[PDB]
């Protein structure tokens, strides 16, 4: 998409070298924001093939909460096996603050529903939010938040999100993750009985590593095609009573798929 | 500042109308992100008249971590006077989050201490991050963080912030904004023998008040200045150990002040 190669180049023109966790090097720049018109279509990168199986099946398990991965594992959904335990658990990673925000006075709060109140009884508030980064379950967790924290706005009948996103692999990982959230505006928005607005994406740590090159070169070299157009097929009595079956994407003609290499 | 002119431009040219808390109307946008290269100089307003000492204050106080507002009235300072009890208490508001986070299992956590631990030993990190948004003890304070999230960065000897805002009266408030955290950035960087990089603002519902557009139409018809530049006058042995007296502005050339009246 526009926004996504513009962000690569960004990357390639400004980034600075340096390192990761440990181990493969990266470019990367600090401070990024793009914005995604909704109404434009959904953003599902075209310039190489991606699907939206596992994101949908992601995005349905933290709407319910349970950290561990049987669901995801049930439909063949693998992208958590990496950091699960012997169990299939993660430790209280994003669901489980999603849903359950563990607090000292012994309660559990639950901010999906706390937002989608706030949502139908006070749309103009300026904190309708939702925080993963709980400082006191970091050590506990996975792995630590990247998609930490995110705000809600409404706007003449348009529901609108920004996501702060601490870190950001740009090729491998944030295709995936502007479309998640898309699909949870969308969800929300039916949800509210309201349209979907933008969908605004801030990073921190942006970067592109040294092994992915040859492969952003490669999609930089490629013409975006028109966004598909999302389609829910269904309207669900709540946020936590959506299926798999419900969404489908029409109109998605994206160019070859493009492997990621990673180390280990 | 030319970026705080462009954004009060861009609230006029974009922003929506509609309401606040409970009164007085806005033009609103969702989203924004602006940066100073704090190299080239302390990003104080010169279209209008602004002064430190509120700000180095409070700075000062937020890195204590009490919460009672006994050392700001110590030295006159008002600011949050308006929403202090009868004993001078705030609830776990910024401070007490910043320094000691309380955890389900008792625990307090430092962040402050935390984050310059990283910049000293893992300055690469992608997780240098201070988040007062404590969603289990919202309701005890007195005020929900506005700046509510903040992340570090080190590239090429210099040290970066962005700041997460979720709501911002950009007229009365940002200036003192950007001005606090810039001061944080310098601080932090004296402690971390590192030159001052990048100050990156990410705003969430970032608004005018209708009450404020004579004073901003004003200030954007006066030109920006050249920026002050901040002096520290004294190396402390820690980010705990500054002073009111350590901080200095030089070659502060600003236009007159514009008041700012607000409604009860």
Redesign the interface.
């Known amino acids: 998409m526009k926004q996504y190669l513009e962000l690569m180049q960004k990357v390639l023109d400004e980034g600075?070298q340096?390192?990761?966790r440990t181990g493969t090097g990266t470019l990367?720049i600090?401070?990024?924001?793009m914005?995604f018109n909704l109404q434009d279509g959904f953003p599902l990168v075209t310039t190489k093939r991606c699907h939206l199986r596992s994101i949908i099946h992601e995005l349905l398990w933290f709407l319910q909460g349970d950290t561990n991965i049987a669901y995801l594992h049930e439909n063949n959904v693998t992208i958590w096996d990496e950091w699960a335990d012997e169990n299939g658990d993660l430790g209280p990673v994003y669901g489980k603050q999603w849903r359950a925000?563990?607090?000292?006075?012994?309660?559990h709060?639950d901010?999906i529903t706390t937002v989608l109140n706030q949502l139908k009884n006070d749309p103009?508030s300026?904190?309708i939010?939702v925080?993963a980064?709980?400082?006191?379950?970091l050590d506990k967790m996975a792995l630590?938040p990247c998609h930490?924290?995110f705000?809600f706005?409404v706007?003449?009948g348009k529901l609108?999100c920004?996501l702060?996103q601490?870190?950001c692999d740009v090729f491998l990982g944030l295709p995936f993750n502007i479309a998640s959230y898309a699909l949870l505006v969308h969800m929300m928005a039916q949800q509210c009985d309201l349209e979907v607005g933008?969908f605004?994406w801030?990073g921190?740590?942006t970067h592109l590593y040294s092994n992915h090159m040859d492969q952003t070169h490669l999609q930089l070299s490629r013409e975006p095609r028109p966004l598909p157009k999302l389609i829910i097929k269904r309207k669900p009595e709540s946020i936590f009573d959506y299926r798999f079956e419900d969404f489908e994407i029409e109109g998605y003609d994206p160019h070859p798929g493009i492997k990621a290499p990673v180390a280990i």
């Open positions: 600075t340096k390192n990761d990367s600090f401070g990024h924001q914005r925000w563990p607090t000292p006075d012994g309660r709060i901010q103009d300026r904190r939010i925080s980064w709980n400082v006191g379950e630590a930490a924290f705000q706005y706007a003449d609108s920004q702060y601490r870190a933008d605004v801030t921190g740590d």
